[PDB]
Amino acid sequence: VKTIKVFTTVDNTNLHTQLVDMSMTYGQHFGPTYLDGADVTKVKPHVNHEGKTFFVLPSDDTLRSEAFEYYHTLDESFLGRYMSALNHTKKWKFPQVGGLTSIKWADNNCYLSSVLLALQQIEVKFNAPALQEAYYRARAGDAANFCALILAYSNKTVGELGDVRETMTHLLQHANLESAKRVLNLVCKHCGQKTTTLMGVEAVMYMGTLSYDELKAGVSIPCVCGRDATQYLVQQESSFVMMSAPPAEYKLQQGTFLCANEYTGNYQCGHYTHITAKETLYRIDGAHLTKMSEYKGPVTDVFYKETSYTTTI
């Protein structure tokens, strides 16, 4: 009979040596099973699953009960996906680089580091108590729990490359952005001018341009009627803004921005490095730290600090 040697844990520290019978579901061996942040309760054991550690979560366990108030989520697989990915993120190294907490390269965490580095510089707060606890500990150097939560809130698996803008979007859904306000005036000369209002994550993020000043002057976006119109920023009541765009050559001048992220490589297979401005421009590539006065490379996301804004027009 087909067999395999897999370890299963309920504490992420103590392993249980187990033998499973292939052709039979993982859910039939020990119930709800999770591996590297993936709900693997209905998958049959594959050959490439040997020697790996699986997490088991009883449905009767009280940890599933008090899951909402602590994590602010309704997904039943959240606890298992978070605990299984936590077993792998405990193996990562979190070196302090340039005063900020980073991550050593492992399992394509090129994007997870860039997200963690950006959050340390923006004045942001999370409504979920688990995030605020892990976010604090992530700043002290112990960021294993924070990275596992990010993979759970983003429905990702350890080893899979993720997008920074997409991962920040799922994450900021649990952040305190109630007082965030963005007022945009769209001017279609065949439909007059109308004013839209975004609140929350939509008031902070934008996709299309990297320049905050370009948003203030005017960008092109399709109107509802079906033709190109121009829109510019009118009011901004947030602690920061995140500008996004595809990778392209872009000059980064000191003092004009807060931090940024670069992406070198093809679509869905590349490498993120973080750019931050302090006394000089820093380029944090996980554990490596290089300084330069001016950086010109393919950047995708640029952060700007803000308290309040009103147009001059």
Ligand X SMILES: Cc1ccc(N)cc1C(=O)N[C@H](C)c1cccc2ccccc12
Q: Which residues participate in the annotated binding site for Zn(2+)?
A: 88, 107, 110, 188, 191, 223, 225, 269
Positions in 251-310 near ligand X (CB under 6 A): 263, 267-268, 270, 300
The DSSP code for 32 is S
Cβ-based nearer residue to its own copies, 151 or 233: 151
Positions in 191-220 near Zn ion (CB under 5 A): 191
Question: C-alpha dihedral over 295, 244, 196, 180, to 10 degrees?
Answer: -80
Q: Distance between CA 135 and CA 118 in Å, rounded?
A: 12
Size of the residue set binding ligand X (CB under 6 A): 10
Shortest Cβ 92–Zn ion spacing (Å): 7
Cβ-based nearer residue to ligand X, 41 or 261: 261
Joined together, the tokens standing for residue 138 give 């992530």
Shortest Cβ 274–ligand X spacing (Å): 13
Q: Distance between CA 27 and CA 59 in Å, rounded?
A: 11
Shortest Cβ 88–Zn ion spacing (Å): 6
- DSSP line for 225-265: SSSEEEEEEEEEESSEEEEEEEEEEEEE-TTS-SEEEEEEE
Cβ-based nearer residue to its own copies, 44 or 305: 44
Cβ-based nearer residue to ligand X, 141 or 208: 208
Question: C-alpha dihedral over 114, 116, 119, 121, to 10 degrees?
Answer: -70
Residues making up the annotated binding site are: 88, 107, 110, 188, 191, 223, 225, 269
Q: How many CA atoms lie within 13 A of 125 on its CB side?
A: 9
Shortest Cβ 190–Zn ion spacing (Å): 5
Shortest Cβ 35–its own copies spacing (Å): 11
> For the chain, where are the alpha helices, taking DSSP H only?
26-30, 68-71, 78-89, 110-119, 129-140, 144-153, 164-172, 212-217
For 188, the 3-state DSSP assignment is: strand
Joined together, the tokens standing for residue 227 give 């033709």
Site residues for its own copies per CB under 8 A: 38-39, 42-44, 46-48, 51, 88, 91-93, 104-108, 110, 155-157, 159-161, 264-271, 288
Site residues for Zn ion per CB under 5 A: 106-107, 188, 191, 223, 225, 269
Site residues for ligand X per CB under 6 A: 161-163, 246-247, 263, 267-268, 270, 300
